[PDB]
Design an enzyme around this catalytic site. Sequence first.
Site, mmCIF file in Angstrom:
data_model
loop_
_atom_site.group_PDB
_atom_site.id
_atom_site.type_symbol
_atom_site.label_atom_id
_atom_site.label_comp_id
_atom_site.label_asym_id
_atom_site.label_seq_id
_atom_site.Cartn_x
_atom_site.Cartn_y
_atom_site.Cartn_z
ATOM 1 N N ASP A 1 10.915 -12.295 5.819
ATOM 2 C CA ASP A 1 11.222 -11.371 4.732
ATOM 3 C C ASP A 1 12.091 -10.207 5.195
ATOM 4 O O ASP A 1 11.877 -9.055 4.815
ATOM 5 C CB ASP A 1 9.931 -10.835 4.100
ATOM 6 C CG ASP A 1 10.158 -10.246 2.713
ATOM 7 O OD1 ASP A 1 11.145 -10.594 2.068
ATOM 8 O OD2 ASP A 1 9.338 -9.437 2.271
ATOM 9 N N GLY B 1 0.833 -1.189 0.000
ATOM 10 C CA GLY B 1 0.000 0.000 0.000
ATOM 11 C C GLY B 1 0.870 1.242 0.000
ATOM 12 O O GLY B 1 2.027 1.187 -0.414
#
EC number: 2.7.11.24
Length: 337
Positions: free
Chosen positions: A131, A19
């Site tokens: 990650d 986003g």
Amino acid sequence: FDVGPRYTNLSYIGEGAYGMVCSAYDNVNKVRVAIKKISPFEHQTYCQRTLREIKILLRFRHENIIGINDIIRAPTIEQMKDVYIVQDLMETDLYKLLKTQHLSNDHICYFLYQILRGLKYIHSANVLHRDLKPSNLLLNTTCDLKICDFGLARVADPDHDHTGFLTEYVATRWYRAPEIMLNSKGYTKSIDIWSVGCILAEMLSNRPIFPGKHYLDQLNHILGILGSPSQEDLNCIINLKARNYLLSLPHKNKVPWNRLFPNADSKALDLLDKMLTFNPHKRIEVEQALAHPYLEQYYDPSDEPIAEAPFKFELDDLPKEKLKELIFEETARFQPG
Ligand SMILES: CN(C)C(=O)c1cc(-c2n[nH]cc2-c2ccccc2)c[nH]1
């Protein structure tokens, strides 16, 4: 970008798959914050990342882990098209810094310590981040560091970590441990340690150490530096296709770290070596890493908190709709009333 009355003076900061994030003024605290707008209710996968991150970040509380201060959404599920996550506001991230800034050894040492301090807490909760990479490490103007983006995080599951050769994987390529391409699902804590090792190497030279251009090329980069795996390490890989691929490669010598990073602190390279160990069972764990001589200026295990309770131990098997209520439910506490 309607964040209601409470937050005004929105200012763009960065965008991405997660986003877009904007700066904003919080009228209630008079402090300026960061706001991430997410529209996950478009595909169910984005919904899984949204839900993992929210549940985890709400239960986590640690100086080196980004928090969720507030969540802004519409009053009702029907009216809720977007979710806004209010989080710590920081000046930059490690990715931006490494593009243009040379880090002093003192900075490299301090950043590494905070990354590991945060990781001790995450792993103590039985959670894997999965990650870790420079863009997921935020810094403020005094170089306090916070780990963000828990969208790929999972509960550790060592017992179900084995899989076949060349099994597809989602986490960012340059920071994947060699075993991901060989026989691992990335369900053990050693996966994050590798990523931190890659981050350390990158801080030493302002370049990714293993910049693979495609899935299998990533392994080839790794072996080009560490060299061919020893017989012992080969023997730990039972899957035949994985082992025989390795056996099919011409012999490669290890590249000594002090040749790759000639200006680096020798203690830093000894720790690097231990984080970038081929065999995951021999790879250093986060608490050992914190106790390593390279970090002795900072090491204080009583000032390195762990979580009050782990996770328990799926979002994989529910509709973007089903967990649209889960997101709505988990964000309930932030709505008035
Ligand atoms: C995945 N990301 C970028 C996040 O979860 C995130 C970043 C921030 C943030 N706080 N201060 C600055 C940022 C930011 C830096 C660079 C790019 C986008 C946001 C808040 N959540």
